[PDB]
Design a binder for this molecule. Structure first.
Ligand code: HEC
Length: 115
């Protein structure tokens, strides 16, 4: 259900996640997260947006990737995101990331959920 709607919104459609964390990829994601995402997010505390340490436990990868890559489409069309907007407010969250960058950040998010 929520991953399918996230795929339809796009641009990412599918992310097949291998069982292991790729630590080098995650490390690039850590650096990116601390450049772009900590303007508004923390791992364990609310801030401008929701806490994210366990985002990969409550959401899937297509939703997370398309939040980074198409935040406007997600805000407009995805019911989970639309509800979070009513709670946290409307602001420019688009960091103009590449898919590569977003993928690295996802790997970091997966890693911190195992800490
Ligand atoms: C402040 C300008 C933000 C920046 C920069 C980033 N995010 Fe964000 N995020 C923000 C808000 C206010 C919200 C709630 C929705 C709304 O627009 O009001 C979010 C939400 C998310 C989510 C969804 C969390 C959930 O539990 O489903 C994710 C996965 C997310 N944000 C990720 C994320 C990442 C990885 C960022 C750096 C690339 C990032 N956001 C930037 C506010 C802001």
């Amino acid at each position: 259900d929520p991953e399918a709607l996230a795929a339809e919104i796009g641009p990412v459609k599918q992310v097949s996640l291998g069982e292991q964390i790729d630590a080098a990829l995650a490390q690039q994601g850590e650096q990116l997260f601390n450049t772009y995402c900590t303007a508004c997010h923390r791992l364990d505390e609310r801030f401008i947006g929701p806490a994210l340490r366990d985002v990969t436990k409550r959401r899937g990868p297509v939703y997370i990737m398309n939040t980074m890559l198409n935040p406007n489409g997600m805000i407009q069309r995805h019911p989970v995101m639309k509800q979070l907007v009513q709670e946290y407010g409307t602001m420019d969250t688009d960091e103009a990331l590449s898919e590569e960058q977003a993928r690295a950040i996802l790997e970091y998010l997966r890693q911190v959920a195992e800490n």
